Structure formats: C-alpha cells, structure tokens
Design a protein around this nucleic acid. Sequence first.
DNA 1: AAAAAAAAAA
DNA 2: TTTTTTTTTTTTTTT
Lengths: 362, 362, 362, 362, 362
Amino acid sequence: KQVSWKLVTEYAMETKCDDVLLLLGMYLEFQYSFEMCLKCIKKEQPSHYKYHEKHYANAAIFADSKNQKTICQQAVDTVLAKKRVDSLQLTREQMLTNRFNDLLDRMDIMFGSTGSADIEEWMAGVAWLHCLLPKMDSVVYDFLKCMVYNIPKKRYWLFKGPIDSGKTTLAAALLELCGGKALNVNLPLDRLNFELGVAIDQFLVVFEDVKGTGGESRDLPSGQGINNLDNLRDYLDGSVKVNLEKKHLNKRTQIFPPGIVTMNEYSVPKTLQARFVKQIDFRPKDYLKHCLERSEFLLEKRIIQSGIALLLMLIWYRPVAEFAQSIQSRIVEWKERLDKEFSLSVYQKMKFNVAMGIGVLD
Amino acid sequence: KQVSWKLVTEYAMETKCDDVLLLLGMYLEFQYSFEMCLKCIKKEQPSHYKYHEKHYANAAIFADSKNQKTICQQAVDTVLAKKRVDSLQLTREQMLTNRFNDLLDRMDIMFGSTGSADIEEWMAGVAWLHCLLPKMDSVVYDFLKCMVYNIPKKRYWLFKGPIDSGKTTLAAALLELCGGKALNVNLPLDRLNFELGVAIDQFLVVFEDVKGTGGESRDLPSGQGINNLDNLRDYLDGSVKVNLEKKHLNKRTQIFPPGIVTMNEYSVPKTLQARFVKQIDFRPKDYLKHCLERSEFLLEKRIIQSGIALLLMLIWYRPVAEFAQSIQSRIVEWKERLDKEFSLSVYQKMKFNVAMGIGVLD
Amino acid sequence: KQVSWKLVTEYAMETKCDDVLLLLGMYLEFQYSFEMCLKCIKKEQPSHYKYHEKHYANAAIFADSKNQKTICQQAVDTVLAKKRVDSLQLTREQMLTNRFNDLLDRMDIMFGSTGSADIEEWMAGVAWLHCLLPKMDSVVYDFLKCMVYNIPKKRYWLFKGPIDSGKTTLAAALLELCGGKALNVNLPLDRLNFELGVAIDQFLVVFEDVKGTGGESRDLPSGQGINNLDNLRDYLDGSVKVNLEKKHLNKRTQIFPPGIVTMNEYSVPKTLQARFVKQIDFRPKDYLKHCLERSEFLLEKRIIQSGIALLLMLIWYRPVAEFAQSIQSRIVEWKERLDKEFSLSVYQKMKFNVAMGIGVLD
Amino acid sequence: KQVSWKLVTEYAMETKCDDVLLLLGMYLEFQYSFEMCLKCIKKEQPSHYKYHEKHYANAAIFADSKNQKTICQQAVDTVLAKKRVDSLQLTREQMLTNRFNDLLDRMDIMFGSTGSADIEEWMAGVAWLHCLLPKMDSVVYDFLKCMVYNIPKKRYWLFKGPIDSGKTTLAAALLELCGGKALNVNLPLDRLNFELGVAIDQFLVVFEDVKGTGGESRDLPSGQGINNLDNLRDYLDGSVKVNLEKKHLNKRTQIFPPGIVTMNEYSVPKTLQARFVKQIDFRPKDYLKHCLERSEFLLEKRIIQSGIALLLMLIWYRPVAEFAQSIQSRIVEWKERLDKEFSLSVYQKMKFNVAMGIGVLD
Amino acid sequence: KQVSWKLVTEYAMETKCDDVLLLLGMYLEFQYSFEMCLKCIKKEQPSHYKYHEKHYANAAIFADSKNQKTICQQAVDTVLAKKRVDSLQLTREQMLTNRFNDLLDRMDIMFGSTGSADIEEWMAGVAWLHCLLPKMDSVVYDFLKCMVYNIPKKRYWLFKGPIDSGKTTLAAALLELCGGKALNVNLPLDRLNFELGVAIDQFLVVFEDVKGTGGESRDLPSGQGINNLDNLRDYLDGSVKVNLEKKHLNKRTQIFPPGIVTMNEYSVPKTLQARFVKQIDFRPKDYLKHCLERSEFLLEKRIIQSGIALLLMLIWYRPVAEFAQSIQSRIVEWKERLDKEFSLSVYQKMKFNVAMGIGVLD
DNA sequence: AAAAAAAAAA
DNA sequence: TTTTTTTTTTTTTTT
Ligand SMILES: Nc1ncnc2c1ncn2[C@@H]1O[C@H](COP(=O)(O)OP(=O)(O)NP(=O)(O)O)[C@@H](O)[C@H]1O
Ligand SMILES: Nc1ncnc2c1ncn2[C@@H]1O[C@H](COP(=O)(O)OP(=O)(O)NP(=O)(O)O)[C@@H](O)[C@H]1O
Ligand SMILES: Nc1ncnc2c1ncn2[C@@H]1O[C@H](COP(=O)(O)OP(=O)(O)NP(=O)(O)O)[C@@H](O)[C@H]1O
Ligand SMILES: Nc1ncnc2c1ncn2[C@@H]1O[C@H](COP(=O)(O)OP(=O)(O)NP(=O)(O)O)[C@@H](O)[C@H]1O
Ligand SMILES: Nc1ncnc2c1ncn2[C@@H]1O[C@H](COP(=O)(O)OP(=O)(O)NP(=O)(O)O)[C@@H](O)[C@H]1O
Ligand SMILES: [Mg+2]
Ligand SMILES: [Mg+2]
Ligand SMILES: [Mg+2]
Ligand SMILES: [Mg+2]
C-alpha cells in the first residue's frame, strides 16, 4: 500500500510546520509501535503524543519511501499556502483572535495537570510588568488597537530609553502576544534586503535596538541603523505596497507590517519621527531591579518576556466586552479561574512587594 | 478519477491569480463539501462563494494529487501569459478602460447591499481629496491623459513638499486607479535591477519618497535616491527599450512604465528635472489636519488613498464624454446613483466642513 | 491524441516570437473555435487572425496538455537558435537588408486598408527630422555605411550636446533602423555582465546617457558611465572577441556590435575619445521647439523617434542604387508611392514651416 | 534484489553522519566481502568494523546502483531532521547530558584496553587546568549552569586578559565540553552575516579575540570586533529570535546561543558590557609557563585544550548529585576508576609540582 | 525510427561547436531535403554544405524530437570534454600545431576556389610586416620557439620604442597566431591580482603599454607598470607554479604563460631587465608611415595585424622542415600556391615599393 | 551547495 | 499516465 500524502499534509496543517526538516523528523518518529512508545507514555511533547496513534500506519509506509522530502515539501507548501490565504483574506482582528486562541490553547496545557507552569509565578510577572509603565494595561490595549487598525502612517511605536530600561522586555512580550519577527537593521544595506524579506506575511515586526549617530557625548557608539530606517520610510508608512525579497524567490508585493522600533537615546530625523504615532520613554527603576534579583524565577522561566503574561494582564484588567465575540467565552472562563486562585489581596500584596524591591512572592 | 489542470487554469484566470501559493491555498479550500461550507453560507469572500460549487469535484481529486504545485505553476503561467499578451496587444486606452471596469465591478459589490461601504463616507473622501490640490479633478484627468499619451520624455510627474503634505496619499490613490507598482530606489545600486524588474508589464510605477544628496540642513537625511534616478536616466525617458530582470527568467525588454516621483524637498539636478513634465507642490494645510482628526473614518478605512475615491471624483466632476465609449453606459448609471443619493448641497456642506476643519460629516 | 510540437515551433518561427510567456499566451488564444472568433472577425492583430484557423486543432490539444511551457521553451529556443545562426553566418549587408525588408513589411501593413497611420504626418516627421543636422540624408548614409563596414577601432560614433539636443531622438531612430539594443552602463562595473549579455547577436548597441566625471562646473551629476566605457575599450575597438553571458544558456563569444555613445557634455578621457570615428555636436534650435509644440501628433505618434521615419527619409533622398539589389523591388514601389502622395511644393512648404517655427502642417 | 534505503538511513543514524560524500564513501567501503576485510581485522576505525558485516549484503547492491547520491542525500536528510527535532524539543539539560554521554563514550575508547592514551597525562592536565584560575571547578560548574539556564541578557561571559593568559585554552576546552563553534567577529562587516550563520543549532558560541579601537597606547592593534559586536546587541540578549543565514540557505529564526567573549584589554562600551554576566580577568602565571616547558606532553597531546580534561576535572571535584540523573551511573563508575588509579596524594603532588613550575609528573 | 545522439555529437566534433544554440540551429537546417536546398547549391558556408548530405536523415527525425536541447547539450559537452583532455595532455608543439591547422583551414576557406579574399593584399601585408624589423621572419620564428619551449627565465620579450612604432600592431599579430590574451599591469596593486587571472589556461600573454615611473622628465606619463612588473618576478621566471584567480572563482595553480612586454621608452631597472631574453628596439620609419596612407586597405581589413598574415610570412620565408611534421603536407600545398601566384621578382618589387613609400601594390 | 525550475523513464 | 531524474540559477562576491 502507498503512503498517503494527504495524511502528511494533514499533520503539517494541524501542527503548523513551516520547516520541511522538522516535519520530516517529527513524522519519522511515528514509525515505532504506538502500543509501547515511551514519549506517549511520558506525554512529553504535545505535537507527538496527540498524533502518533493516528499516523503510525502511514508513518511505517513513509519510512520505506524513496521520496520523503518531496512529500514533506508539498505539506510545507500547503501550510505556507494557507498562511498566504489567511493574510490576504482574514480581517486583521480575526488574525489577532486566531493568535489569542493559539495562546489560550498553550495556556490550557501549561496550567493544567500536565503542564509545569504555576499561575502564581506567572501572575507575579503580571504584577512586575504592570509596574514598568504607567497604566500598562491601557498601553497594551492601545498597542493592540493600533496593530489591528493599521492606519496608513500611524502604525509604528517608538520605545526609547537607557540601558536596562525595559524596552526589549516589553517589545519581546508584545511580539509573542501578537506574533511577528524581530529585524536587525544595523547591518549594511546590501544584506538588509534579505532581512526585510523575513517580514513576508507576518503580523508585526520589531526593529530591535537600532543605533543612530551623535551618541559619543553619552558614550553611545554610532551605527547605521537609523540611516537605514530612513531609507525604508516607504515601508514604515504602508500607504503603498513594497516588494519584499527572500533567496531564490521572486519579490512579493505587500504592505509592510506594523511594529515597534526600540533604541537608546540617539537623535531621530524629523522625517522618521513623522512615522511614529507614539513614543514611550522607558526609565530604569531601582525597585524593579531589586525585585528581580530576589524573584529570579521571573528571568529563568522568561515570564516577564512572555505574551502569556501580557495576555494574563489583559484577562485580569480589561473588560470582557473589549475582546472579540469568539474569544469572550474563553476569556470569561479564564477570569473565573484567576478570581478563584487569587483574591485581589494576593495581587495587591504582589504589587506592594514589587514597589518595596522585595521578592514578589514574599 | 482524474485531476483537470484545465479547471485550475479556469479558476486562476477568473480570479486573476498571479501567485502560486495563493492559488494552491484557495483551490484547496474547495475540497470540503459545499453543502455545509460556512464561507459559502456566510458569503464572506467572492473569490470563494462564486466558485466552490463548480470546483468541488476537481478539488477533491486535487487534494489527493502529488503534482499540486506543478498544476498551480502552469495555471499561474497562463495568467502571466494573458498579461503579456495584453501588455503588447492592447492600446493604453483599453488597458485603462479595463482597469476602470475592474474597479467599477468592485464598487458594485462594495456599495451594494452585500457590501460594507457607506457611500456617504467615500464621497466625504472625494471632498477631502478635492481640497488638497487646486483643480484636483483636472489634475487627475491631466494625469490619466498623460499616462495614456505615453509621450517619450514627457512621461513622469514630480511631487514635492514637506513632511505630511499629501504626496504619498495622492500617489497611492493614482497607483490604485491606474494600476502599477511602487519602487524603492534608496537601496544600493547593485541591488536595483530586481526592484526595477517589478515594473514588468505594469501600467504605472511610483518612485516613492526618494532621498536626495545634500540638503542636510533642514534635517533631511541624505541618500542615494536622486543620484540613482539620474542614473537609470533612459528608464525615465522611454525613447528606448530597457532590459528588466526576474529571478530564473531571461531579461524582458520593454519601454519602462510612466509614473510619479515623490520626494521631500531635496534639490534635483537639471538633468533629472528635464525628465519631469509637471511638478506639483504639496503644501500642508491646518484645516485638512483638523478635519482628519475629527473624521478618522477616512484613515481607518483608507478612503483618501483609494482609487475608488478618485474614480468617484472623476464620476462626479468630469463630463461623461471624457470616459471611453465602452464605459459610458456604466458611468451614466453611477452619475445617476450619486445624484440620487447626494444633492449638490450635501456635498457643498461637506467641502465647507473641510475648509472649516470640523468633521466632514457633521 | 498528441500535441504537434512542430506546429508550435512553426508558429514561433512565423511570428519570430522569442518570449516564452508571449508564445504561451498567443497560442492559447487559438483554443477557442475560430468560426465565431471576434479577434479574427475584427482582424485586430495580424499575429492572431492569420494563424488561428491553421493552429486551432493543435491548440485545443495543447490546452489539455500538462507540459505547456516545455513545448513553448523548445519553440522559443528554435527561434533563438535561428537568430544565433544568422548572426554568425550572414554577411553584414544581408543583415541590414533583412532589417529593411521587415521594416518595409511593417510599413506596408501600417498604410493599408486595415491601416492606422497618415503618410503626411510621417513625412512631416521626415521634414522635421531632416532639419536637425546639416545634410541629414548624407549623415544617415555615412552612419549606415560605417555600420555595415564595421572597421575595427573605427566602429563607434559619439553624440554630444546639452539638454533637449536631439541626440537620443536620432539614436533611437537609428536603433530602430538597424534593430540594435540600448545598454545602460552606469551600473557598477562588476554587474554589467548580463547587461552586456543583451548585446549578443545584435547589429547595434546604443549607450544612452553615459554619465561622466567632473561635470560639477556644468551642474551635471557624475557617475560610473565613462569609466565603465573606458574599461570596455576592447569592446568598443572590436579587435578581439568578448565573452557574453545570458541565462538559461551557456556563454556566447563574439565581436561586440558597433554602436553610438550619447553623452551630455561631460569631460571625456583621450583614451576613449581617440577611438570614436566621428563626434556630432548636437545643439538646440528655437524653431524646432516651436514646431514640435505646434504639432503634437509628431510626439504622440512617436514619429521623430522612428526608424520608419528615417527609412522613409532614405526613400525620399537616396538613389535607388544605394539599396541592396534584392530589396530594390520594394524600394521602387515606395518611391512612386511617395511622389503620388506629395509634390515637392508641399514638402518644401512644410520644410519652410519648420524653419518658421510654425506647425508643420499646411 | 533492490537496495534498502532504510539500511543506509540506519547506518547514517547510528553513525550520526551528515555529510553526503562521507556517507557515500563509508557505505562503499562495505562492498568488499567481510571475511577478507583488512579494516575489520586491523580494527582501524569503529565506524567500519562495527557495521560492515551487517551492511555488506546491502552495500554490494548499493555499489551497483545508479542513484547512489540520492540514497545518501535522504539518509543525510534524516540525520539533519533528527538534529533539528532535538534542537527544538529537548531541554538544554538533556542536550548537555547527551553531549556528556558522547564524551564518556569517547573516554571509554581513549582509556580502554584498545585505547591509546594515559590517564596520568590527562589528569596532569586537570592539575594544570585547576591552577589556571582560582576555584576552577566552581568556575566550570557555574559556566555549565549558566549555559543550561540561558537567562536572557545574563548569559555571556567575558574572558579578558593580556597576551598568553589561557583565554583560548579554557574556551576551547569549554567549547568541546558543551559543543559549539568559535566565531571571528573581526571580519569586515559584510562578511559578518555568514560568520554568525555558523551559530545555527549550536549549544554555545565563543567569540575569539575580539579586537577593539582603543589601546594603541598599550600596544594592542586596532580592529573592528567590538564595534561589530555592539551591532549584535540582540544576538547577545537572547530575548528575541534572530534571523541567521548560511550561504544560499534561507534565513532561519532562532535564539542565538550563549557563550564566551575573549579579548585583550581593549575598552568595552557600556551597551556591550551590560550584556556580560561575569568578567574573568585572566592573567599570566610564571609557574604555568615554567610548568608547561617541562611537561610538554600536555601541549603535544592537546590535553589542556580538550573537553575530556575538563570533564575529568568535574568527575574528580564535583559531588555526584550535581550531574543529571541519567548520567549519574557513569559518573559514579568513573569516580571509582579515578580513585582506584590516583591517590589524592598523587594529585596533590601534581598541584604542588605545577605551583613550583616543576614538571607535573616529576 | 530513433534519433542518433552519436551523429549529432559527430557533427559537433567535426564542426567544433562549444555553443548549444549554434549546434541546435545549424542541425535544424539539415531537416530540409538535400536534393534541393539552396545553401548547399551556393556552396556558401562549409559548416553546412559538407555535412547536410549525411545528416539529413538524422535531422529529419531530430526535428520531430522532444529532447532537442538535451541532445545538443550532450554533444556540446563532448566537445568541451575533448578540449579539456587536449588541454591537459598535449605537448606545446601540438597546441601550436593545432592553431596552425585551424588557421590554414581558415585560410583555405578565404583563398580557395570559392574564395573571398585577395591574396595580393594579404601578401602586401607580408611585405609591410616584413619591413617592420630587421630579419622579421627570424624574429617571428624565434619567438614561436620561445613560446613553444617555455624555458624558465628565458621566457619573455621586451618590445620597446617611441610612440607610434608598431609595438601593439605586432603583438596583436603574434597573439592571434599563438592564441594568447592581453593584460593591463598599470593598475594600482589592489586590482592587479584579478587582472593576472586573465592568463588562466592561455598559451601566451602580452603586457600592453607598461607605463614606467621615472620617465616623466620627458613627455612619458609616469606610472606603476614597471614597479608592479618587477614584483611579479615569479610569474615572469616560470620556474614555479603560481596562484591565479578569476572573479567569483577559486584559485588555480599553473605556470604563468610566456609573453611580451610592450613599452614606451622608459628607464628599466637592472633586475627587471634580466628577466627578458631579448629586447627589440622598434623605431619610427617615415617611409612606412607614408606607405600606410597610400595603401590603407591593409588597415581596413587589419591584414597587418592578423595572425594569418604572419603565417603567410612563415610559409613564404621559412623552409618546410621547420614546420611540424604533421602540417608539412599542408604547408607544401600552401607554399606552391604562393609560388605559382607570386614570382620572387614581383614580391621583391612589393618590398621595394614599401621601402620607397609607394603604397601601390603593382 | 542548495534550491527553484524543468525534463526523462518505464 | 504515474514516478523519478536533470538542468540551471541564485547567490555570492564584489566594489
Ligand atoms: N525599568 C527597569 N528597571 C530596572 N531593571 C529593568 C527594567 N527593565 C528591565 N530591567 C532589567 O533589565 C534587563 C534587560 O531589559 P531590556 O528590556 O533588555 O532593557 P533595554 O531597555 O532594552 N536596554 P537596551 O536594550 O540595552 O537598551 C531585564 O532582564 C531586567 O532584568
Ligand atoms: N496637505 C495636507 N495638509 C495636512 N495634512 C495632510 C495633508 N496631506 C496629507 N495630510 C496628512 O498627512 C498624512 C500623510 O500624508 P502623506 O501623503 O503620506 O505625506 P507626504 O507628503 O508624503 N509626507 P512624506 O512622505 O513624509 O514626505 C495623511 O495621513 C494625513 O493625515
Ligand atoms: N535640436 C532640438 N532643438 C530643440 N528641441 C529639440 C531638439 N531635438 C529634440 N528636441 C526636443 O527634445 C526632446 C528630447 O530630445 P532628446 O534627444 O531625447 O534629448 P537629449 O539631448 O538626449 N537630452 P538628454 O538625454 O538629457 O541628453 C524631444 O522630445 C524634443 O521635444
Ligand atoms: N595563565 C597562563 N600563564 C602563562 N602561560 C600560559 C597561561 N595560559 C596559557 N599559557 C601558555 O600560553 C599559550 C597560549 O595560551 P592561550 O590560552 O591560547 O592564550 P591567550 O590568552 O588566548 N592569548 P591571546 O589569544 O593572544 O589573547 C599556551 O599554549 C600556554 O603555553
Ligand atoms: N615604424 C613606424 N613608424 C611610425 N608609425 C608606424 C610605424 N609602423 C607602423 N606604424 C603605425 O603606427 C600606428 C600605431 O602603432 P601601434 O602599434 O598601434 O602603437 P604603438 O607603437 O604601440 N604606440 P603606443 O601604444 O603608444 O606605444 C599603427 O597604425 C601603424 O600603422
Ligand atoms: Mg534592547
Ligand atoms: Mg511620502
Ligand atoms: Mg538622451
Ligand atoms: Mg587566544
């Protein structure tokens, strides 16, 4: 009997593999007899134990096949095809709702019986993040609205401030919450062309720690990053479709995604400042630093960087009526869960602990 | 049974699908039965609900196929071949007439009972756009005439003015009305051959926010753009055929499209000014800014940069005899629809509100 | 039943089609039955209505085939192979005679019952174009003599003059008269490889706008152009073969074609200038500008740029003995036809109108 | 009978072979009959004598086959697929435990009856290494734990010190112990992309002697290293997934490995210093120099550079409980072997010897 | 019946086609029936009329083939393989003997019964070339011997003299006879290494117009050629193999080819002078100056710069025994053709006329 | 070399 | 017609 190419494509669609080698490796694991397999007995990785029993019959025939990478490439092309359909056909609020469901699925595994995560530690991350900027929940919601509305010159936010002020921390958390890519535009213009091609069909880009000039009076070393962004100001506007490029593929024409620019206090040209709708001035705080070294699980488990921490913040602080109709059902359930496991008094003591620089759980 | 490559060519041709991954994605959605399909029920996308019932039988066989991307490649090659033939064989009047028919089809769906667009909001777009440049309806007709009369060396228009003056706004509207591609020539000169290759068989190009050398007082960052356009000088002239590159394809040779250059008050060489038949000076106006702040639907729905806003402007202001004979009958219907839904007095109140800087609809 | 690949190759040879997508586009239009075919009934395009009835039966089978672009590649390669053979085999007067013969075929369909041109406008172009230089008929006979004789180190002519001097209008007409290609050599020297590849099997190349060095005293931007040409000095001399790379293919070696350099008043190094045969100093005239201004049809119909206008000028001025003995059979027919259209009086009158700076007509 | 592609993939997996030509050469060795095979009788290389008898039947049929590289490519693709699966799915503690197992498998061969090496020479390495830096066993355990926890922005170490001070010695030993590659960030900034592409799927990286711009007054050569490294801030941070590229391969998105920066006493900008957890001030020891001059087998055998000498240090000094529970069995066996072969007095004498700069083994 | 790929390969080997399109194009011309076709009847191209007769049957079946480019590619690959075997395995005498045979067969086409070239003008070329130096036939014959023997040190010749002394004329004639290439060593040292890469696999190289440094006390432009060339000592001597690199390609090792230095009369250092075996003082001759003007067809068809003109000089002046035994039969035929058309008295009169400045050939 | 685009075998 | 094998370019290097 022949290998079903349909079942490989179905597995790739269910797990959302863009990576042809990862799909090959995953599916080859399904060779071995389901009745005994240690990974399913451990329930180690969910993209295995949920799928092995279904795919075992096909994976045994797949292992005999002489064209295995051709099968996996078609399956990856089917996942890339659906992603390009979704980008052109979904409303941008549907795209965010789809990302929130994927994060809520990940939360259901993390905080259940199987998962390692302790919501007490993750909500301590919510408390630490809510102390970073004034009215942080409103900041997050206003960012989401901006990324959803995609208003044709009002699409980018600027994060500015010293070393260890929290810019990359909040940017990486918003990058996981919305989904997107990080781009390093400090590299020279002849390689920059392929860096920008990583934005093809993405929801956000974050331009991380871009360097200007005129910094040596502050011992900030100069670089080309801000001169590179001002050559790309066509891409930051998003009024017209730009032509993105990746190796061997012909150019794709699209509106370049919304995003965040993070920098130290270099000077920004007025032409580029015109592209940024809002600037957030991050300031280092002594108590946030003292709190983190007494609360090291926040850094080790990467809680303060995680989109799941900002999503928990939105669940805790925002009204139900702000979420899209599809997720409001799951959101109401998560609000009940947080009010069951924390009183307001535990959370208010967590924020008091942060302001004192004491360990968040103390 | 057997997969029909012909039917995929029909769907690609009717959808006018240039992208192999988009065609693959869309056609695979037809594999599910149209008796239950929620997107046929909801009628969310016209590229689906019109076609699914016809293509279900073939999409079920396509989903079992091992050739899937090869089937899609030939269909896409047929759509690109149809554009090649049209680009050589049609007069520029007929090419523009076809683009107007395509926009009028889209207007019918958009302003019909199935559609989401309030015609009153888009006619407020016509009012805002008409206040940007004096005699803008004549500017638009003069531009269309200029792009149809592909007169060598009298082919390109220059847009000049400060930050937030309207250059990108109007160029983006003309780009959608006429059809064309935006090009960035601020990137370095070794890489531009593949940027210029996007102009193959396009009706217009727009060279967007290109940067001058010098002029670093006034805080304008210098860049290669204007020198790169003084290079490439025969591309702008269009007396001679230029040679254009796509990856894995031989050098296509054609007269490079006419177009617009938008730039931010840099100094232009006399050699390059000799290529531009008309310069438009965009000037920032306080009342347009305050009008937009109070009538934000214009930016959220992207009305003021849409080709449909300019097409509605031409339908309102130009006499029918200036449109092509084939499209007269459809345009008389639209003039009747606008005069039915709008008096002149409602529209003159809209223009009065724009000059007042209050909300255009108030 | 099978496709005849030989009928597709016969169509490509008949129409001299060397673009693979254009051949696919053209031949697919034959799949509809010719008896109701509007494009045949209207006789719009000769490349369709001549051939549809013959190729219909094969195009129906071709439309069902699964390897359509392979069939077209072989047909295109047959046409490119003929162009390659005739480039190496033909005596260089037969090359120019062949090029005249299908310019005369092109004229014969322009001015016929299905025609779309006025001989008075095209001869008004001849009258205008004859004014541009002293004894223009002798100059074009000198140029064509140089291009057929192709004497080593005596192969190129230099056109210099300020803005709007006529050098591109004449080079573009000579380009169409000989059927060369225009090469932009202002790109970086390491990336001219595929652009010089366009010169393979051509009769001329025109170096439109080679930017020089030291133009600042004249407000002329500098660039790589002249220094690239001086690094191509062996290509200009033509004493040795050069190795030209073009894609889907191995490299072709040939003596590089002769040609024209057009140049806006830059400083030129003696090592370059010393090996052009003749420099023509173009300069503007007030009466030509007012004449073109008062007779817009010349520009709109591309008359003054056209090698058909220069070919008509050769009919009107040169003895019948100058043309090749084989083409004289067509030249003598056009000779009597132009006398039948125009007396010397109306020609001299329009020569006077040009000299008076009034509209060339009447 | 047909060739088993499965048995080749099995050989590739058991050998961990990811070079197509090496796999082809290795499997072609097996075609010659087992009973006669001189490589099996001499027990030359374990990758042959273990596997030949099993694969001879298949290798004879492989040696006749016409698609030998296609067979090996799939087998190499299967090994690379497992590497990419394990890269995403393992915890970093398991990655390090798998590396320690592969090292202990090497140690079995090195110090066994067939082995080629003397434990006393290698343990003299442990004594020389422990004297290089104070509390070296804690420094190495703290390093392992730092690379395993991978705390963002708290995950690179700085090895700073003058000429000949042991930096590259310890870095090479740590790089073999953990696995990883060295990077030369001093290259011109265009090359930097393909340098950084070496970090793909690696557990560590080391930046070997990054040169700065300062310190000409202390006789340190200027270079671009520190300036290039400060462009890579987000690569050192590890908060965001950076987009690495190899030659011709498309961009792969991952968290950049943690690691070590080695440099002479150039000045470090505060933005780059803020990304290093620990500065280890390496300084030259008179006694280590006089010791190596009289114990040169350490250099000849490459003992002090080797991760096996650092692993022996960890087996000697650290409690059993600090190792992963999977490998504790082997660690306990190796502690008993070391206590059997070396009295503490033998090791004490070695350290007293190197402290005096006497030959370690005296 | 099936196409013989062997007959296509045989045609390519007998025509020496490196070119896949030229092979395809010529072979398709054989598809027409031999009894009637015009190119045969004209006897115009020997690469057709010799071969069409036998290849007709194969070309008819080849015209129906679907593989046409694949067949020609294999045939061309055989001719390239033939060249690479000959390149590595021939003696240097055989390489020159093959160049001679190709030139004699090219001569026999030019001068035969179906000829196209006036043997008297080419013999006036011999008379003008012989007058350029004392004992020119000994200069030519000894130079050929030097390049053939390729003796270390005794390997380069210095062509020195005033401006307009014929130095580049004679070097160009020797290049075409021996099959070399020309180099520009004047460049600053940076790009010199890619310039030396021109020499890979060439038989002979010429250093064209080597500018010296010290001469500009006179009108001689000071340049770096001599001091560059002094440093290239190992390339000149040819004792040891040197690395050569073509752009974008890896280095190859070979003995750098023998050659000529062409110089204006700069001072030469003693160390460079030792590496030339002979210096030729070219001097200006007024009677040759006036002879050129009175005979200019020599320049118009470059007879006095063609390799065939020097080969005619060797055929006229040198004995049969000095030519290679393989070619002596064709040389005896060619000697008799010159003897029967030119008496020594008529040829001596040509030399006398040249010596008198009489350009008339008589 | 690695991939995209393209052609041959049974 | 189903299934496997082949060619060529891009990229990279270069400036
Ligand atoms: N506001 C803050 N006050 C004190 N410590 C902070 C703050 N924000 C972040 N940190 C600490 O600094 C580390 C790095 O934060 P990060 O967001 O990368 O700083 P940043 O503003 O991006 N600095 P940089 O990227 O170097 O300009 C975090 O892991 C925290 O330990
Ligand atoms: N003439 C105008 N006066 C005031 N506001 C305007 C005007 N035109 C446009 N705007 C505002 O400017 C925004 C951007 O316009 P846009 O056409 O992109 O500017 P521009 O002239 O291209 N500036 P820039 O691209 O930076 O050179 C619009 O979204 C409006 O909010
Ligand atoms: N001798 C002339 N005097 C005045 N106008 C002229 C003359 N020749 C041409 N023109 C006008 O100049 C326009 C462009 O001529 P063209 O030969 O393309 O310019 P040019 O000299 O090449 N300019 P440039 O390419 O910038 O050097 C034509 O379309 C005419 O309108
Ligand atoms: N701490 C030390 N004191 C004295 N000699 C040492 C020390 N460590 C190493 N050596 C010797 O120095 C040699 C080079 O050591 P290595 O670790 O490569 O130096 P390094 O610090 O990397 N030098 P550099 O790379 O120039 O900064 C070793 O082979 C030893 O012979
Ligand atoms: N003895 C002679 N005296 C003067 N002119 C001559 C003589 N012999 C030949 N010529 C002509 O000299 C011209 C230039 O010679 P050529 O060899 O091209 O330059 P050259 O001698 O290399 N000068 P240069 O390159 O500046 O060193 C040719 O066109 C010859 O026809
Ligand atoms: Mg940062
Ligand atoms: Mg703009
Ligand atoms: Mg011009
Ligand atoms: Mg070192």
